[PDB]
């Protein structure tokens, strides 16, 4: 064993600083050569040579060395790792019966034991006037001798012959007899129920195989009743049945305004029932109508409803940015009810409901305590390199919570002194540490490199100016003047209206009286877009007007973010007249729930809906708002007043049209409708990504190969896309080998950056997809249970900050 | 191997070591029990040619409502309600966690010790118990 080289090549890196670079060099990557995968390493050339000179010595030592030999060297290479990470291989449930009780010498209380097979321990501590008495513990060992449990899959497509695998277990030493039967329902077409006697061996198991073929779509009910020698036990299972194809969600928003305060009148709207072209049959088009009181009324119903929803539930987790979007909508509600002094809404004690909001502002402050490095710097992924983009976004968010939750003083102080002292050039311009790309800017590379540096410093000044009132030292203001000078001396002329607006907003937190400053704001007003005469709507665009002369609808995430930056620089200059068509456009492009398109145009566009919502006073919003179908009767209505304006978003079942009726009244409320169709094909959409996905049989096991390549937009650099998310939906009964996805994100030669298998999806985030060659993901799968009539699944990539730059492919 | 009684057996070990004397161990209890069974409480002795009623309780320790067919099996030395070609079956439901007294009218004919066998099985289920017990018939 340990032939000759394994003992010498590991002892050389036994006490090295780059021993971990050698460790993940010797990992098996079959489809990438040694230099091909070494190119994506970015930790300096010292880590590359420790990688490559441990990579070449294992591909040679895998030709004529044994299988038994190399898997002993996999254990000898274990000491090149950092020490064993704290992990537990068990999941203990949330402990029930956690309460205190006043017992007058005898008390009885009843409860249901939870559906788990574990031996509980109930202990009692009695605090009274005599002292403390720890009672003798009792056990609650719920323990069945023969029991089944079924492996009900989470999501079954309609029209598949699902084999429901389950296993009976027999803890008893004597083998015994049993029979399992299944409660047939009207939906389930299964191939009075006969009992056929099978037999488990002693201290063993026995497989149980049924077969269903569901027809109806919804949450069904199947009861598995094992009747062994020790009685009959019914195990109640819920089988969710799901349609086939992609799920498209389209939106629509209307602002109700019976009095026409800030524009033209608006007293009526219809909702056209447009059935699309490539629809699946037999599945209803579902709609949900939501009617909310204030401008922030859609935002309040996110935070005050205990359903536990986020603004961007469609976008995946795993970033540090996704952990800052769990403290933002709690904050912009708390910035409203405290500065505007609106603590007279709640029927509960408002000092108590203030504590539960300050609860979540304190929980969310802990969520990026883990993404902070040792030098108080913030890294995007877990354990990744530090970023000047995230720290400026971590100081923007935390520098705002300080007025309502007391921060740690020194935490911001070493963090602001990391940006100014390490990553700011002589001419104010900042730079980036890692290869993280938050956004993709247009133009060719020498024109873009100036434009990328302008966005990167203008996103930094917002991080400084929101945190300047916490740690106001003399160096971070010494840096701010050349930071403000660089945002003067280079942003005109701007090659993109997106970078022009964030340059104008970042300067709109300091000296607002420069001859160059209002030169920007006049030039920012020059490239605005207007609807109607007088303008009922205003918005902006990513393109300059001279290179692109089009004014479209169904705007993108660059349209809603650039609109909100021009808004907040004109709410800091306090221009009411110019921004009244902007608020009407922004609060109608908002989806249902509070969420906008992406993350970066929700943090910037709820502040615009809160810095303008602190201009509207108590408007007596009390209407008898009624909605109906045209060729049908009304569902219902209710007295919608200031007492209850957070009402429940109603469901629309009948397939007629919709008309929302405000007659007379007073107020300014909003109407939002989400439609949820299921589709068959997607070729009529715009694929901005070359996609191909194959299923191939490797020989070392069925493997799945999926590649992706960014189609560049016109007048862009051909370097590659920004932060993108690969979302392979797995087919039914197929499970992904997670150890093959761990090997793509854990090395120093990582392809992706984070993975998560969530509800049968395979979601992979990534810094960049190139445009020259494809970027392929290779993980093995295995048929977990047999499924006939296998409906094809989908494969979507999309940029994380522009989720409409996408492409979709069906596969099976 | 356990015997066929649904009771609680009590085992009793008593040792003898030549230098440690006698040690009587504590009673250890084995608890034989099934869920659907037949209890056949029988008299010690019944008179020949005199008609007696023998009840047979059926316990159902199952949370389901069950459906059971109970058959008094034929015996040649009896004059029971079961004929030679046809047994005396009777079907009825039992509630969950309850009993049902099933009375069997039997007049013995020959003296000695004869079997009274009763078989019962649940409809469309697994549980099924049969009991054969001997009956002491004496003359006078
Ligand atoms: C962390 O370093 C290793 C990872 C792995 C890993 O499983 O990824 C590994 N496994 C491995 O060789 N398997 C054998 C059975 C194999 C043999 C031939 C062809 C393919 C093979 O693999 C599928 C060995 C490793 O180091 C050993 C010494 C290298 C050092 C001393 C330079």
Swiss-Prot record, chain A:
Residues 15-44 are annotated as: Involved in C5AR1 binding. Coiled coil: none annotated. The record marks 74-75 as: Cleavage. Disulfide bonds join 21-47, 22-54, 34-55, 179-195, 413-471, 687-807, 707-776. Changing residue 197 to C: Risk factor for poor response to eculizumab in PNH patients. Changing residue 197 to H: Risk factor for poor response to eculizumab in PNH patients. Glycans are attached at residues 64, 223, 427. Residues 21-55 form the Anaphylatoxin-like domain. This is Complement C5 alpha chain. It comes from Homo sapiens (Human). The chain holds residues 678 to 1510 of 1676 of the full protein.
UniProtKB/Swiss-Prot annotation, chain B:
It comes from the Eukaryota. This is Cobra venom factor gamma chain.
């Amino acid at each position: 064993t340990l032939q000759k080289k394994i003992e010498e090549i590991a002892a050389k890196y036994k006490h090295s600083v780059v021993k971990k670079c050698c460790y993940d060099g010797a990992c098996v990557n079959n489809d990438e050569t040694c230099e091909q995968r070494a190119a994506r390493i970015s930790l300096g050339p010292r880590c590359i040579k420790a990688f490559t000179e441990c990579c070449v010595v294992a591909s040679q030592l895998r030709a004529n060395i044994s299988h038994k030999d190399m898997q002993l060297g996999r254990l000898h290479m274990k000491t090149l790792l950092p020490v064993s990470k704290p992990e537990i291989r068990s999941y203990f449930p949330e402990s029930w019966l956690w309460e205190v009780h006043l017992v007058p010498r005898r008390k009885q209380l009843q409860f249901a034991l939870p559906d788990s097979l574990t031996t509980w321990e109930i202990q009692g501590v009695g605090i009274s006037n005599t002292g403390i008495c720890v009672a003798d513990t009792v056990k609650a060992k719920v323990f069945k001798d023969v029991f089944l449990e079924m492996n009900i899959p989470y999501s079954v497509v309609r029209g598949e012959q699902i084999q429901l695998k389950g296993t009976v277990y027999n803890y008893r030493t004597s083998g015994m007899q049993f029979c399992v039967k299944m409660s047939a329902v009207e939906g389930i077409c299964t191939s009075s129920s006969k009992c056929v006697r099978q037999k488990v061996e002693g201290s063993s198991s026995h497989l149980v195989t049924f077969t269903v073929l569901p027809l109806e779509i919804g949450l069904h009910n199947i009861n598995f009743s094992l009747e062994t020698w020790f009685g009959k036990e019914i195990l109640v299972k819920t089988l969710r049945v799901v349609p086939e194809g992609v799920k498209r969600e389209s939106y629509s928003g209307v602002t109700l305004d019976p009095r026409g305060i800030y524009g033209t009148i608006s007293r009526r709207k219809e909702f056209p029932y447009r059935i699309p072209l490539d629809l699946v049959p037999k599945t209803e088009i579902k709609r949900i109508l939501s009617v909310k009181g204030l401008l922030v009324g859609e935002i309040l119903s996110a935070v005050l409803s205990q359903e536990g929803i986020n603004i961007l539930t469609h976008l995946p987790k795993g970033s540090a940015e996704a952990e800052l979007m769990s403290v933002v909508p709690v904050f912009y509600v708390f910035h409203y009810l405290e500065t505007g002094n609106h603590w007279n809404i709640f029927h509960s004690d408002p000092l108590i409901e203030k504590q539960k909001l300050k609860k979540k502002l304190k929980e969310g402050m802990l969520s990026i305590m883990s993404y902070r490095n040792a030098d108080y710097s913030y890294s995007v992924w877990k354990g990744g390199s530090a970023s000047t983009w995230l720290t400026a976004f971590a100081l923007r968010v935390l520098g705002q919570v300080n007025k309502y939750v007391e921060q740690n003083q020194n935490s911001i102080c070493n963090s602001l002194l990391w940006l100014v002292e390490n990553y700011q050039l002589d001419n104010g311009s900042f730079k980036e540490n890692s290869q993280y790309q938050p956004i993709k800017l247009q133009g060719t590379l020498p024109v873009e490199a100036r434009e990328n540096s302008l966005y990167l410093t203008a996103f930094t000044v917002i991080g400084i100016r929101k945190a300047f009132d916490i740690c106001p030292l003399v160096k971070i203001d010494t840096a701010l003047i050349k930071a403000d000078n660089f945002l003067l001396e280079n942003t005109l002329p701007a090659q993109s209206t997106f970078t022009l607006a964030i340059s104008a907003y970042a300067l709109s937190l300091g000296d607002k009286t420069h001859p160059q400053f209002r030169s920007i704001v006049s030039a920012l007003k020059r490239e605005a877009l207007v609807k109607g005469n007088p303008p009922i709507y205003r918005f902006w665009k990513d393109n300059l007007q001279h290179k692109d002369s089009s004014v479209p609808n169904t705007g993108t995430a660059r349209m809603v973010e650039t609109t909100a930056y021009a808004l907040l620089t004109s709410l800091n200059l306090k221009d009411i007249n110019y921004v009244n068509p902007v608020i009407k456009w922004l609060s109608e492009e908002q989806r249902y729930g509070g969420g906008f398109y992406s993350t970066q145009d929700t943090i910037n566009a709820i502040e615009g809906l809160t810095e303008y919502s602190l201009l509207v006073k108590q408007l007596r919003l009390s209407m008898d708002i009624d909605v109906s179908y045209k060729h049908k009767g009304a569902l219902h209505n209710y007295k919608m007043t200031d007492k209850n304006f957070l009402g429940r978003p109603v469901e629309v079942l009948l397939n007629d049209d919709l008309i929302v009726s405000t007659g007379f009244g007073s107020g300014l409320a909003t109407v939002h409708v989400t439609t949820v169709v299921h589709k068959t094909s997607t070729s009529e959409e715009v694929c901005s990504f070359y996609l191909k996905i194959d299923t191939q049989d490797i020989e070392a096991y069925k493997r799945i190969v999926a590649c992706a390549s960014y189609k560049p937009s016109r007048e862009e650099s051909s370097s590659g896309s920004s932060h993108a998310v690969m979302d392979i939906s797995l087919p039914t009964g197929i499970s992904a080998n997670e150890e093959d996805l761990k090997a793509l994100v854990e090395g120093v030669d990582q392809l992706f950056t984070d993975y998560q298998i969530k509800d049968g999806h395979v979601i992979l985030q990534l810094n960049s997809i190139p445009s020259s060659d494809f970027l392929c993901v290779r993980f093995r799968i295995f048929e977990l249970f047999e499924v006939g009539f296998l409906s094809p699944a989908t494969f979507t990539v999309y940029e994380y900050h522009r989720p409409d730059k996408q492409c979709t492919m069906f596969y099976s | 191997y356990l015997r066929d009684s649904i009771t609680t057996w009590v085992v009793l070990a008593v040792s003898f070591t030549p230098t440690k004397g006698i040690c009587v161990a504590e009673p250890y209890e084995i608890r034989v029990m099934k869920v659907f069974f037949i209890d056949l409480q029988m008299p010690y002795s019944v008179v020949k040619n005199e008609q007696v009623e023998i009840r047979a309780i059926l316990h159902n320790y199952v949370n389901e409502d069950i459906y059971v067919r109970v058959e008094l099996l034929y015996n040649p030395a009896f004059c029971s309600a079961s004929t030679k070609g046809q047994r005396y079956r009777q079907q009825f439901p039992i509630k969950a966690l309850s009993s049902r007294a099933v009375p069997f009218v039997i007049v013995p004919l020959e003296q000695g010790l004869h079997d009274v066998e009763i078989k019962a099985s649940v409809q469309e289920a697994l549980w099924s118990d049969g009991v054969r017990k001997k009956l002491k018939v004496v003359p006078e």
